[PDB]
Amino acid sequence: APSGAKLLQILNVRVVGNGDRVVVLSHGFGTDQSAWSRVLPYLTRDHRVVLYDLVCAGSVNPEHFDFRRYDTLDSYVDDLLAILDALRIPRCAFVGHSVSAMIGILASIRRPELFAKLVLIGASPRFLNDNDYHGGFELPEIQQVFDAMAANYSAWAVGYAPLAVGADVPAAVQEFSRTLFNMRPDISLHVCRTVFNTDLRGVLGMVRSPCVVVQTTRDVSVPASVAAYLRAHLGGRTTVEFLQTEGHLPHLSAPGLLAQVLRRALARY
């Protein structure tokens, strides 16, 4: 597996901004680090911002996608820590969307002194239901996503993109579809399978970093009740912030409102 040093190029690592307060921005499924481009200038005057692409992003050469290594989220965590260690960053705030919120939770447990604060957007510890637990999906319907992605990825993408964006923002729909279509279909399916096989409920109590959970009014993959569950079970001091906007991708569809929350969350850590 590639070293942290090699990952700096493979994952298109970028470091921008001023100061010694470090913020890492980690994008979610179906995008790449360009998803942060609209909120980024709200952070770079006050923070040193580290950006990178998950190995599944369309902007990463498909040759580096190890279908063995990456069938667990633990390997995505390995990559994040390797990048931060290569950059010689001992302490940071971490902002993760979607799968990266799960990666952030796992990274905080692996390296408690490295993560001074987590900000989780579109966050869920488990997407499948379980008795007294509402995740949003039953097993036969995650299986329906899989069959649709495999049978007709392009048609699945055009249907999913407006649902994910949620609000009526056509430039966000087109920009998300573009990065969804840049992904190779088999890699896209593989990451989705990995995310739906992840269940972090049993380790939330092991997180000790303070956390801010960012909740929008409506999220196709995250039920409103999930944020309360995270606040109840995360092992650190946790606050829920409410974006009065609709959708799963507020960094695409409502950058100004999102930036207000991020600046508040990242003021002291």
Numbering used by the authors: 0 to 268
Reported in the publication:
Strigolactones (SLs) are a class of important plant hormones mainly regulating plant architecture such as branching, which is crucial for crop yield. Different from other receptors, which could only sense hormone molecules, the receptor D14 have dual roles to sense and hydrolyze SL, demonstrating a brand-new function mode.
Here, two putative SL receptors SsD14a/b and the interacting F-box protein SsMAX2 were identified in Saccharum spontaneum. SsD14a belongs to the α/β hydrolase superfamily, of which the structure consists of an α/β hydrolase core domain and a four-helix lid domain (αT1, αT2, αT3, and αT4). Furthermore, results of docking approaches demonstrated extensive binding of GR24 by residues in the catalytic pocket of SsD14a. Mutagenesis analyses revealed that residue R310 at α10 helix of SsD14a was crucial for the binding with SsSMXL7/AtSMXL7 but not SsMAX2.
